[PDB]
Structure 1
Amino acid sequence: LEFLGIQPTLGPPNQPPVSIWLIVFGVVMGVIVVGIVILIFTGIRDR
């Protein structure tokens, strides 16, 4: 239903509040630091 001279203008969406990729990277970094520390502890522990 177009009026040929009137265009829609009020349709601005904004779904993601703040950078969910930041939280994903944070959890990945946490998991990878846990792996680093457990691996280094096992390596220095295995005589």
Structure 2
Amino acid sequence: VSIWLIVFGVVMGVIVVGIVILIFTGIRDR
């Protein structure tokens, strides 16, 4: 499977959910 695609899929997954927390916090904050 290529171990580099798994580590990319975890790292790009924890980034793209970290932006939808920091966007809804801003809104649910102002």
Q: What TM-score does the superposition give when structure 2 sets the normalisation length?
A: 0.82
Report how far residue 21 of structure 1 moved. 0.5
The ranges of structure 1 where at least 4 consecutive aligned residues each deviate by more than 2 angstroms after the TM superposition are none
The structure that is helix-richer by fraction is 2
CA distance in 2, matches of 1:19, 1:36: 27
User: Structure 1: any 5+ residue segments left out of the alignment?
Assistant: 1-17
CA distance in 2, matches of 1:46, 1:36: 15
Counterpart position of 2:20: 37
Report how far residue 34 of structure 1 moved. 1.1
Compute the RMSD of aligned alpha carbons.
Answer: 0.7
Query: Bigger radius of gyration, 1 or 2?
Result: 1
- Paired positions, count: 30
